[PDB]
Structures are given as C-alpha cells and as structure tokens.
C-alpha cells in the first residue's frame, strides 16, 4: 500500500503543470496522528480534482495544457485512492485557511511518504 503510493509519486515531477499553480489548504502548515493527516490529505485532493476537472484556469488554452490537465486529474484521482487506502475513517475537519499551491502541497506530501518509506526499511 505505502509501496504503491511511492510508485504513484515516482511520476510526480512529470505532473508538475499549469493547474498545479492553483491553491489548496496546506494541512501540513498547521501535529495529529498519521491516520488524521492522510484523511485530511485525501480530503483536500478530492476537493481539488472535483472542483477543477471542468475549470477554465486548469484546462488552459494550448493543446499541451488540454492533455496535461486530463492526466493531472487522472494522477490526483489515483493518488487520492492510495491515500484513502491509508486514512481509515472519512471524518476529519479542515479547520485552517493556510493556502499553498498544489505543486507545493504535493512535494510536501512526497517528502512525508518518502520519510515514512525510509523509516520502515532496514
């Protein structure tokens, strides 16, 4: 499962695009349990892919942007599934306004999973 989310995030930098400039609540800016963090991460990504799949600011105007938008949504939907698979419950409040670009939140999160993965390896 954690091996699987690392595998999804291996192709993170290829996904750093036009739409990754928009904001997201940085649930890493404001300490809770690991299951609470995963739940709050999985929530924010879902909120993003469902609010920007048809957003003009995400689709862009070039052909490259049309394709990159689609692939971003696919990448986020995938990532969200990995995260829920580690979150346990679905009840957690997003009691913070601390915005972050999606790009930053994903790098932040990638660092967090990489620490967890290097802590469970001997």
């Amino acid at each position, epitope marked *: 499962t954690l091996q699987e989310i690392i595998k999804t995030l291996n*192709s993170l930098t*290829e*996904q750093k*695009t036009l739409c990754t400039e928009l904001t997201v609540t940085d649930i890493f800016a404001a300490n809770t349990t690991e299951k609470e963090t995963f739940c709050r991460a999985a929530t924010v990504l879902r909120q993003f892919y469902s609010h920007h799949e048809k957003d003009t600011r995400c689709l862009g*105007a*070039t*052909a*490259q942007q*049309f*394709h*990159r938008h*689609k*692939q971003l949504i696919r990448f986020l939907k995938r990532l969200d599934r990995n995260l829920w698979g580690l979150a346990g419950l679905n009840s957690c409040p997003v009691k913070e306004a601390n915005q972050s670009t999606l790009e930053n939140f994903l790098e932040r999160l990638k660092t967090i999973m990489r620490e967890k993965y290097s802590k469970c390896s001997s």
Partner: antibody
Amino acid sequence: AVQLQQSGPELVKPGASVKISCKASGYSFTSYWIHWIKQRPGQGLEWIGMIDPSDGETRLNQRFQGRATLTVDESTSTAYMQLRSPTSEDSAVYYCTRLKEYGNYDSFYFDVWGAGTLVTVSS
Amino acid sequence: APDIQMTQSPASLSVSVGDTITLTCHASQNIDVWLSWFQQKPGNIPKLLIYKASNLHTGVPSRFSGSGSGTGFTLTISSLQPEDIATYYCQQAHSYPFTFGGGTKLEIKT
C-alpha cells in the same frame, strides 16, 4: 510493429450515412488518442477530430457540425468515424493517425498513419 | 476563437539532385515551437519528418533540418535525393483545431 489498418473504399449516395474503421495493433491502443484527417485535392489536410480510446472522450472541429461521430471498440482495438448527411464536398481520402506522446505531452505528434480510405459521395 | 492559419511558400519548386532547398511555413498566431513537418509522395500517405520545429523523427535522414519559433518556420533538405521529390506540409499543435499548411510540391528539373 505498430500499425493502423483502415477499411476499404466507399461509394455512398447523398444523405446515406458512411462508417469507416481504423484497427490499431502493435501497441497499447488505450495509451494514445486517435485523430481523423480529411484530404481533398483542391484543399490539403484538414483535422476532423480526435478520440481517447481509454474513455471514449471526443473532440471535433466545429467545421463538422455534428456531421462526424467518433467511436471506439477497445475489445477489437477499433476506431470508427461515421459521417452523416454526406454531400459531394465530403468526397476525400480519410486518414486515421495516432498522436504519440513522450514525457506527459512534452512532445506529441502524428507518428503512425493508416493507408487512408477513399469516400466517394455520389452527385 | 479563430483557427490558426498555416501558410507555406513557395507553392511549388523545381529542383535537381544535389540542391540545398529551404521551404517556408508561417503561423497567423504564435505557435511556440509546436510545429511538425510531413512528406507526402504522390499517391502515398503523409510521413512525419520533424516534430517540435527542429527535432528529427527516428529513421529520418540527417539531410532534413527544421528551424523556427513563434510564427516563422523553415525546412531544409541538403543534397536533395530522388526520394525527396514530394509535397511537404507543416502542422501546428499549439491549439485545437490542429491546422496544416497548403503544401510545397517539389518537381524534378527535366
């Protein structure tokens, strides 16, 4: 290796619809968008539209005002283009092509092409 | 949103084996470096030569060369071979709908 096999020539009456196939082989069919291109002697090459074999999403050139319908059968790896209300103006060689991409659309181009299909629309 | 119009010049050109030739392509709007070149031999199908204004497709001989960014673009055939007598088209991938030039037909000098 990678191939796109198109269907044979068509002789159509006006108002009668026409449907051509494009059968992909030698690669994961669902990985790239299939595009359809029109070629008339006077004109040159015209982009009709495209279809995503992974989900059936379709984008068409406004110039084909719901004239061309694009479909896929991923069970047989086949792309289709249906032209409704064809007229003399629709007589052309219709090509299907795949838009190969690298590094998540860093580079994207029409690398492989089908042999074309002559559609003759009777006067 | 208006379609990006692609213009090629000359419409045709007489040529001999050994010649160094340069065909022109112009975009009515900025297309960055999103430009491909195709060769179409009489009665045959379009074949990609160059993608992204200057990158050669695998298998395409080095005598073919591309240049440009923005709106002005070029194709060069150095030491033109008999195989190279064809019609050449450019195609922009900046925006949907994708658009092609009218072509440049190469004709052999008799």
